[PDB]
Nucleic acid binder design. Structure first.
Length: 71
DNA sequence: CTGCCGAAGCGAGCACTACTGTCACACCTATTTTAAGCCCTTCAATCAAATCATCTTTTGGTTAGGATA
């Protein structure tokens, strides 16, 4: 279940650590680095944008704090 | 016509802050030579703090890779 990464690393058999395995997985994870979108992400993104936008300026990469799975 | 002696208030002895004449011995430096320690200048050799140049990491934003709604 993408979980208990110490056991994943031990079972992988290449002497990796849990943190290395997790880092490699997340950098190549479809579920994290989305190409699609979801309803709650769009709704909350619009909410933060409308709250904090002034004219043509918006917090592009700071909204990443609230929704999961972006840079 | 001049002259003596009392009443009261004064008094004493005991209680199982610096000058000045001298005077010779003190002070004073002419030079010799070491063996380890010296103060201050004075610039030159060396180092590290500060600055500037440029590459890189993340926001704004676009291109066109990539996408929803």
């Amino acid at each position: 279940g993408h979980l208990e990464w110490q056991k994943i690393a031990e079972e992988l058999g290449t002497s990796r650590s849990a943190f290395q395995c997790l880092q490699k997985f997340q950098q190549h994870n479809k579920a994290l680095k989305r190409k699609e979108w979801t309803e709650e992400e769009d709704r909350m993104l619009t909410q933060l944008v409308q709250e904090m936008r002034v004219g043509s300026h918006i917090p592009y990469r700071r909204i990443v704090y609230y929704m999961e799975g972006r840079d």
